[PDB]
Amino acid sequence: TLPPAWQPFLKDHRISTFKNWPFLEGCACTPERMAEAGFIHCPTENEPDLAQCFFCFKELEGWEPDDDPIEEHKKHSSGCAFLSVKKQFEELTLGEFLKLDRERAKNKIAKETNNKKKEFEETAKKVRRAIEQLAAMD
Amino acid sequence: TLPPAWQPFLKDHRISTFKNWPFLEGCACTPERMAEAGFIHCPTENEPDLAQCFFCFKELEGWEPDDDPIEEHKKHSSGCAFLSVKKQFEELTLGEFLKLDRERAKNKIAKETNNKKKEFEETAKKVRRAIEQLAAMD
């Protein structure tokens, strides 16, 4: 057992998340390929094919059989450092692993910051709309 | 913070154990040199200069100022894999680190096995001595 917070760096842990993934053999976006590209399966009732990059936390859905997970990851999150990792996990140096883990942590902060901004703006629009109606009154 | 069980692989953690080590600047066996060689300070009332290799668990005492910790470690525990580690911690690969950690674990089992054997033999000698006296009786 490696420390639970470091498990997502292991491709086999990532593959294990795809318990009910619908795209299997014959498709480009098989669980092996999705896990290779850095994705974990995060299904919901609303979004059963929802997948998240463990490293940059980009969330993608609406997968089709011909979707190449690497190509999709590159298209939607071109700055994700995981995409530049050419080595296998075991070949990473400790220094490299630690640097990747700090970059992942910065990414998680960035994702939370982004979700907080989005939530606030949803509210600010509704508020702004209401006040716009009042201002429109004599 | 790295997982507490992996801290002993860090030279600075090892240096920190030498709170009351008596051999400082001017000596060969300074805390820096002792930590470099793989030693942790494990003092007792009985043995205040007792030091243990974190990796092979060899225990050495009776240090003199001119003792070179590497040379002592080599003399007393020539098979310790730590002595063959040429890289810094951060330069180790994950695969290499994991292999070193499995070898350390084998070493810890080996040390416990050894201490159990020693304890048993202490008892077996006393018992054997007693029965030897009885056999010596008519």
Add this chain to the structure above:
Amino acid sequence: ARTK
């Protein structure tokens, strides 16, 4: 695929 597309962003959620």
Add this chain to the structure above:
Amino acid sequence: ARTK
């Protein structure tokens, strides 16, 4: 040094 010597073995404990």
